[PDB]
Design a protein around this ligand. Structure first.
Ligand SMILES: C[C@H]1Oc2cc(cnc2N)-c2c(nn(C)c2C#N)CN(C)C(=O)c2ccc(F)cc21
Length: 294
């Protein structure tokens, strides 16, 4: 069994909280898509159940174990909790905090202000999401964990409603690197030194967060509209940056452009990003700005 080290402390599969299988009940599917399905479950503790396909390879198995280790060792309110695992029966389960709000990309797209729901979302809602994730990112940074795929699709919300809390909910890219091809690399979330030299640092996540910010304030659009991966790659390598999302306040767009500085040393750390997000939330001109209605 493979070891895992986080914050200088080493852990193994023996450290995972094995929950007996008879205590776990699947309720409904929530989605599958990627390698494996996710169910809503009960253990009464309500959970999301990540499953390992019984038809899988050794590396799939090791990947599954590793992400169980990774998530169980984090302890922060803006990173999804692991309730436990069930690895001693098939199919194997990872049990996660149930985030009833779903993933952030879908949330933004489905909850866009609309003539029927003209006020479904406000700027403050987006700023709170941004703060939530930047807080999780700061926790990762200060523990020297590099996520490598900070993106709306990998974030979750506790609930649909106003008191929703956003958290990072997938660590599959960090897991692969810890131990995929070009076409699957998240190049649209990657800084120039990452997709060119394969160099990753805490400043890798800063760039990606800038792109997430754009995702948030665009209300769920795909980055670099109309551009393929290679076109984005060459665009960004040449100094190109995205325009402001529609109606985006200038103070918010400024955080994005600072996150997108070519030199990683010129990009803010997450403490500074949080400061600027906080300042945006205080500023009436920012938060009184109306989001577009589809
Ligand atoms: C591993 C999985 O985790 C959860 C998924 C959900 C809730 N809570 C957790 N923990 C969820 C989703 N949609 N809906 C409607 C619900 C609900 N209720 C999203 N989904 C299907 C995913 O696969 C997914 C996507 C991104 C991510 F970061 C983690 C996950």
């Amino acid at each position: 069994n493979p070891n895992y080290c986080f914050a200088g402390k080493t852990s193994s599969i023996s450290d995972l909280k094995e929950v007996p299988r008879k205590n776990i009940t699947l309720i409904r599917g929530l989605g599958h898509g990627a390698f494996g399905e996710v169910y809503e479950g009960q253990v009464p503790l309500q959970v999301a159940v990540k499953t390992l396909p019984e038809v899988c390879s050794e590396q799939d198995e090791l990947d599954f174990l590793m992400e169980a280790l990774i998530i169980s060792k984090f302890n922060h309110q803006n990173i999804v909790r692991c309730i436990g695992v069930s690895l001693q029966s098939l199919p194997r389960f990872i049990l996660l905090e149930l985030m009833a709000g779903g993933d952030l990309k879908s949330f933004l797209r489905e909850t866009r202000p609309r003539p029927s729901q003209p006020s479904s979302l406000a700027m403050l809602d987006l700023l709170h999401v941004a703060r939530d994730i930047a807080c999780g990112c700061q926790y990762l940074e200060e523990n020297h964990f590099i996520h490598r795929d900070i993106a709306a699709r990998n974030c979750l919300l506790t609930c649909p409603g106003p008191g929703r809390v956003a958290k990072i909910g997938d660590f599959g890219m960090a897991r692969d690197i810890y131990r995929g091809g070009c076409a699957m690399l998240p190049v649209k979330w990657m800084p120039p030194e990452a997709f060119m030299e394969g160099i990753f640092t805490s400043k890798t996540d800063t760039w990606s967060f800038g792109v997430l910010l754009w995702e948030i304030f665009s209300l769920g659009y795909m980055p670099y509209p109309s551009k393929s991966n290679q076109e984005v790659l060459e665009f960004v390598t040449s100094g190109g940056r995205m325009d402001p999302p529609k109606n985006c306040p200038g103070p918010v767009y400024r955080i994005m452009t600072q996150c997108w500085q070519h030199q990683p040393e010129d990009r803010p750390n997450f403490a500074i990003i949080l400061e600027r997000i906080e300042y945006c939330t205080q500023d009436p001109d920012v938060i009184n700005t109306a989001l577009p209605i589809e």
